[PDB]
């Protein structure tokens, strides 16, 4: 039932059974993961109105609405801890990520109605753009579970104006619509002004019977007097159901309770165009042959230690199968085709450890795994270009310390080749996933399908072993202060300040808090995200290459045989 | 020598000669303007290495490089005071804006080498994106005068990572290239890592003979020892001319001094495709019939005072001519075609003052100028859609206090119609200029061709009479605290804080508006924008195939 | 003054000095060329009104207007002999091709006012579409020297209706405009209805003082009476200058005579955006090191004879330099980068002669040059894909007898690989030139950047040694009638009818008459056309790859060294 099994089935298998577990390493990784989960929990529960109080007066929390909406176990939260401005509640007042609904993947945004009635808080605008961007790049339906009181008044200057403030998503919703990507909103509670526009910008509007959307809402001693004297009229909240259902017909449908709204959304989701993924499969979905739990021993928290990348790839992709492009050329990178629930993806991943007698442009040299050289860069360039032609999404597994430096490296074209890769990625036009296994550092972070490719990277996730910095604090301390040491003790103070500050500001939690990485995910959650991404990417792709017309597999084969 | 003079020449003229100057108003506006210029000056001069010291060792400052590059008097700086993170030096370490080069408009980005050798500072990445974005939307060549030491080490966490950090411009440069928009870099001084990529991402590389671009540069007591012992070798800065000219050939050309580099850039700029603007003209360029200085009396700093928008439009556009679309329908807005150096633009501007017997969906009502109603919204929708079809760039003059509120307004479809306008703008696909005359407030700021339309708004500028807020502090204080003595404290805290954080300078510092420009600089920017937009447009509507003028005429006669 | 001389300058040189001329071969080719020129001459001079009579009453012929418009010696006519419907005059009543105007290449269409006042004749619509298509694909300004009386009344059914009839160009002109490509028209003489629309559809209208454009023009015994009684009024031809200049302002400018109109057009052409080609050069323009006249000896008219393709490539491209991609892999094809007036092009060309010990999927086999095999097809696929990424236009030199047949070939994926190439070409999105050196046959004609790629092939030209057929008449005779032999003299009659008919209908002149190839060009005109194409393609390209970000040269180098 599949094309070209000779190419796409029974690929080389990779990975060993884990013979030597590392409980202490596992304990270190799980400690990071636990801290993320506790922080996510503490953040979701924060706010003046609890889930309990919400339920008492007939409303569901953001997570209850999501869990009601999605197929159980398909929640891939993104930006859970995103809090670039340090809001007290620890979030941006939206919950967002990928969920599956009766088999259809959709991007989900839910207003956190526990916190200031879903108000726009600092950082929210940016958070929201990352949502509509992901949807845009994947051509994936965007679902708003809206309960939004608009601009948080004290912070208006940070949430109301500017190119990428609270007004932007409404343009982004129109762009999704114009690109042919539907937006569905469940309207809950009071949605004035900023909330109103969030209500009116989507394609389909499903309202709670008590909900409203409006250009403006109901919002010294006389001021208190006027309030009760203007409340005794029982004048209705502007733009309630009798207005936007009965008069304007802007609300297409109206339900009695939150779960009704969710059902309405489900119905409209069921209307949306989506391939049966079977159409794009080259194999029946198969689990990896090696357990993901091993990743807790395989990927070392001791950043000085290498590890075999193949052991990671064997645990993330179907059947631990892998079809490497140009094995032996560019030994610092692994580039090859794999399968995620039967679907083709291109994988690009750093190789760790020492590389004897390499790179070829240096005499008597040893290459450092995690670094990028001429062959690695050209190989990736070719591979990205091949995958682009073939409409094969790229998954980048980053663990990098940069492109090789020095005039020998410069003469090898390395700067040009790294940028050539950037060019290749931008030319690819396909949605891409970036997974930071450990190190995201140097310009290599950018060129390795980094999140700086705003047209291609849908989002990025990291494991608990991950860290982000320009370069290690010690290298940066030398780079920053060495010459000032020769100009002239307060300067060595500054150097230790720097080494410390680089450690502090490169910890997984901080990184995702600032959004350098969208989500820290458990080692056992990496594949689930890959699966969510790949299936979302193949749901309604905007371009097709028939398998028998794909070049990547052919060029791969030829490099093997010729 | 022009198509359809019956439509495009001798349009109705508008505006009166200013009979009653307002010296006190003028003084208030000019005070704001003076404070901007002084702040811009103080910011450009800040940094450890002065223009003087730069010149002594053979280098030009960012502004010297720009002024050498551009036709004199064509500098339209943007983001002069942009400093969202409050860097001490007051800037993002880049100077940027529109300049003209031998008649060709180009977007210019110059590294401020006065400050940490042009290092990436907090806010810079965002600043840079606004540059490549402007270029992208206008299909305008982007010029880098590069002197960039890469990531500022202490602030690496704010300048190195993330979707829109320092790595983003390199993708943006590839996108410009792939969209067919050339990037030209003059490479100066040391450009390692972050600087290297800024050097290598553009289309054309012109290098100073002492310059370098590299993946990585040269960058307890032993550390100082190793330095002098590693400096005695006189080992060359990685990726210098002998490497990137003589070996890789990545530097296409190499010059002896800064002005040589500038000449190289000029030569390559001269290679770039550009219409003679005469091609798109419907008239010979004419100054307005009324002086711009009048704007200092016309546009009131007293925000409670109205003014006649037509008096502004008469002073910004060629010959004070204006061809209004649907005059009398949607009286709260003026929408119509005008001319900027002979080129057609669509103008959309708020009308101020009371509007007797309006809106039509209310009994015995008076409409507030600066607000948006059913007819205004539909009219703008139609006008934007018409101009889009006709490939006519839109210039929005904002002075707004929002769309009308209340259930009567809701039944009039107002929410839907504001969003419909957002849809129309996004559908338009053309580059657009937004000018905040005074008030940028409410969702109206967004729908009136706001900078939130990231695919259409190239950038936005404001006059000294401008201010940005969700709503006035007093209205916000009621909205925030009404339902709730420490509470009246908070309300005055809010009214004050809204005043503080809505002043022109603050607004542009945060980048809510890209530049505060002098009243006499508004037209120059309009001229820069329009001419840049018509230089190499990606789409054409022949004048005789334009709908806007036809539909306009028909509304007048039928 | 150029990027990366190490890659782009001092490429390997190719080709030998011609030691053994072949005068008889030369004579055979030049005979074909002479017949083309005579036919083109006879066609241009045909019509009831001569150039002499035109000049007497103040008008220029199409060729006079073109020659006036263009830089001398830059005329590249296309479709000179295009006459699919066999019109008596031998043409489609338009003259078209590429001309250069003060350094700017433009596509030119001129109404043949010698023939029924520039009326729409059968085949014209198609001819016109090829013009707007070329302009569209190259993003090249389109110039109309219009003198058009609209639909030829007796042939209205063939020139007026249908998806690709006389109304289509007006839509095509709007599409060019919407794509950002300007159309300039010089309006001459009477242009009613069909002519009117041709006048009004362009961007810029320059009128002759006596010209008109109109929805409708002035057009038993009483009918003759009404004519003189309706002519005595001296009622002006509808839509003359007083109307379309003085009233509507549709004519932007008006000139006294034909050369004035041409000067108007020149002025507006001077307004058009165009790179100085220096911007895209990687070298200073250099002539080939070997003379093109040699082509008359090199390319054999005896179709059974091979020849060295390198000798052709050495004579068509700058300095006889060539940078071959994957030399030794896919030995049946040459694919590599070359220079045309300093500008990078990708060249793909058939290798002729026997290929010992090939293809690799057959035991004890000899490959036929001119045929396509696994490595050739994969190589081309890669090369096209590489050049697409790099924004390097492709020039295909076709001399082909098809992809290899048989189940061995089928197992080698040949069908899929040929179609993969079609996919690659369509993915390339760049303008492409196709030159038929000799044989355009089999599906190979299609996959080798054939004119069937309506989004990529701007047009196609052929030498006098060229010929087009599905397969040779003798092979086709067997294929058609062999089985009808076994089933059963009238059948061998039919076989000779076929062999003859295939010869007749595959001669260069017939081929271009039908438009299978757009123009038969002299051996010494091939490079000029390449030069016209390349410079037009680089004039205002819609996409750029910076040289230091180009992959083709890097991947080429690596295949050479690794
Ligand atoms: C261009 C766009 C501009 C804008 O968006 S302008 C902002 C317009 N927004 C409003 O008018 C909202 C006024 N709010 C209500 O009516 C809000 O009670 C509401 C009607 C929702 C919600 O009222 P509830 O009775 O349902 O109370 P909740 O538990 O859901 O939350 C209310 C609580 O959250 C906080 N809250 C709610 N909205 C905001 C905001 N916006 N900012 C800061 N804090 C907020 C505040 O502590 C509120 O207390 P009160 O003021 O006493 O009601
Ligand atoms: C992904 C990309 C990552 C990156 O970009 S990593 C950053 C790589 N950058 C470097 O290695 C630059 C090291 N700098 C030099 O060699 C720099 O002297 C330099 C070679 C330029 C410039 O040296 P000059 O001798 O020309 O001195 P300048 O007046 O131009 O400015 C130097 C001065 O500016 C400041 N400066 C310069 N660069 C930086 C930076 N980057 N951060 C903070 N502050 C800086 C600093 O006070 C410097 O003093 P010293 O350290 O004593 O030289
Ligand atoms: C959807 C679009 C539909 C259409 O285009 S409908 C066609 C509308 N066309 C007309 O009405 C053209 C009528 N022609 C004139 O007025 C034409 O004399 C004319 C005004 C040009 C040209 O008249 P001239 O006096 O300049 O004579 P010319 O030497 O340029 O050529 C005229 C000659 O060409 C021939 N001719 C010209 N036009 C046509 C056409 N169209 N078909 C066939 N043959 C034609 C014919 O033999 C003509 O002889 P007359 O009929 O005695 O004038
Ligand atoms: Cl790097
Ligand atoms: Cl509003
Ligand atoms: Cl074939």
From TrEMBL, chain B:
GO cellular component, one term: methylcrotonoyl-CoA carboxylase complex
Pfam families documented for this protein: Carboxyl_trans
Residue ranges of domain CoA carboxyltransferase C-terminal in the record: 287-532
SUPFAM superfamilies reported for this sequence: ClpP/crotonase (SSF52096)
Name of this protein: Glutaconyl-CoA decarboxylase subunit A
Listed InterPro entries: AcCoA_carboxyl_beta, ClpP/crotonase-like_dom_sf, COA_CT_C, COA_CT_N, MCCB/AccD1-like
Domain of life: Bacteria
Domain CoA carboxyltransferase N-terminal: 29-284
GO BP annotation list: L-leucine catabolic process
GO molecular function: methylcrotonoyl-CoA carboxylase activity
